[PDB]
Amino acid sequence: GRDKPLVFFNRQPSDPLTGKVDMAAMNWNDKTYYVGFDAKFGGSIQGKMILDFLASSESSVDRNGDGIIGYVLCIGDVGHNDSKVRTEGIRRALGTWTGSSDPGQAKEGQAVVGGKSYKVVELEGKAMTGTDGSTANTNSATESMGSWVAKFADKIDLVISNNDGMAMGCLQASNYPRGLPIFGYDANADAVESVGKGELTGTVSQNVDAQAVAVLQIIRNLLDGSSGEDVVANGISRPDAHGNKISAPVQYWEDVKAIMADNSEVTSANWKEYRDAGVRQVSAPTKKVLLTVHNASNDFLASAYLPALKHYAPLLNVDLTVVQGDGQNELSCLDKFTNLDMFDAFAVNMVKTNSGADYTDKLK
Numbered sequence: 001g002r003d004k005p006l007v008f009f010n011r012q013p014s015d016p017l018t019g020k021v022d023m024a025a026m027n028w029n030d031k032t033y034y035v036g037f038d039a040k041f042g043g044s045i046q047g048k049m050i051l052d053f054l055a056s057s058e059s060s061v062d063r064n065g066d067g068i069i070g071y072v073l074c075i076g077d078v079g080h081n082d083s084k085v086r087t088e089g090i091r092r093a094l095g096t097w098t099g100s101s102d103p104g105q106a107k108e109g110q111a112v113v114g115g116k117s118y119k120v121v122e123l124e125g126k127a128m129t130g131t132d133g134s135t136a137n138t139n140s141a142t143e144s145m146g147s148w149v150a151k152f153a154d155k156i157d158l159v160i161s162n163n164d165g166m167a168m169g170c171l172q173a174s175n176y177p178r179g180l181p182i183f184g185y186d187a188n189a190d191a192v193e194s195v196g197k198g199e200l201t202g203t204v205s206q207n208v209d210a211q212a213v214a215v216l217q218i219i220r221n222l223l224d225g226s227s228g229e230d231v232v233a234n235g236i237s238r239p240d241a242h243g244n245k246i247s248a249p250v251q252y253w254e255d256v257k258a259i260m261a262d263n264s265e266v267t268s269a270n271w272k273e274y275r276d277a278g279v280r281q282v283s284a285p286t287k288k289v290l291l292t293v294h295n296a297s298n299d300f301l302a303s304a305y306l307p308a309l310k311h312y313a314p315l316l317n318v319d320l321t322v323v324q325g326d327g328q329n330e331l332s333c334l335d336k337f338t339n340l341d342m343f344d345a346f347a348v349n350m351v352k353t354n355s356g357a358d359y360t361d362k363l364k
């Protein structure tokens, strides 16, 4: 029970307001870990991508020619540290950062367009909450983009979004101005193709494939009887006995027990570039893993993360039982987190980042 591996992933145990890491949950046992990505670095990368685009642009990106680069921001999960730090990244990059990641918290910024200085204004930063309470709702993004165009019109010079889902949702707007620069995050399949079409201007890969392998590989190492650095290194930062290794670069953060993949920008200049050859068939005995997903209709998890898991799982001889919640209530997941005695290891993607206790309670 409490002696088995527990790997949190994609939603780090943490306080949804202050973002401080929940080390109580992380210190569940000596076989507990988190797998994710360097979210803060990812945030600055999204910002840098936007600054580089503006820098290479002519003064035509200033549509109304008022000398101000106006933008609208799609805020996602305000209880998710990885999401908010993207709002922080782009705001810092553009000079609109005031210390808060909340909607309506922005000052006048500054950026270079065609070797000239420009004022920057966040016309509106809004949380795209669905009428059913669902966060980062894509239909709400379409709705908001429609109103924004009607309200601000020629003032909007670009669109920014915490993820691809909402960004691709903006593009659904019937009145979306042809060619309006817009940026997302995740490098979902549809988003990358959109970059190739010259619609979506750019997005960011968080190396989801590296993350998926890392979850399985850590469990693999632990069930093979590894301890210490071997657990977080073998098949991850160095080759294991089988010879397998995650190709993308990965860091281990000891203080928070986290394996973090890095990020890379995706633009018109490199979209064609976007499975791991460094992972091939394992001979180790098969093991049973119960893996949860906080929301079955989550675009990133449904379209990118889960397929990755189901691809690499048999290669590492991990028989994966997948259960999925609704994104609203932790009970939608916790209800399916049962028969824990019939499993060798566990992977948890929580609805709320502060719900660590509820999962470790069941494992007693």
Ligand SMILES: OC[C@H]1O[C@@H](O)[C@H](O)[C@@H](O)[C@@H]1O
Pocket: 010, 011, 082, 136, 162, 163, 164, 165, 185, 186, 206, 298, 300, 301
């Ligand atoms: O937890 C779900 C979230 O994970 C993040 O890594 C993605 O950027 C979001 O698009 C997604 O909604």
Ligand SMILES: [Ca+2]
Pocket: 062, 063, 064, 065, 066, 067, 068, 069, 070, 154, 155, 157
């Ligand atoms: Ca303008």
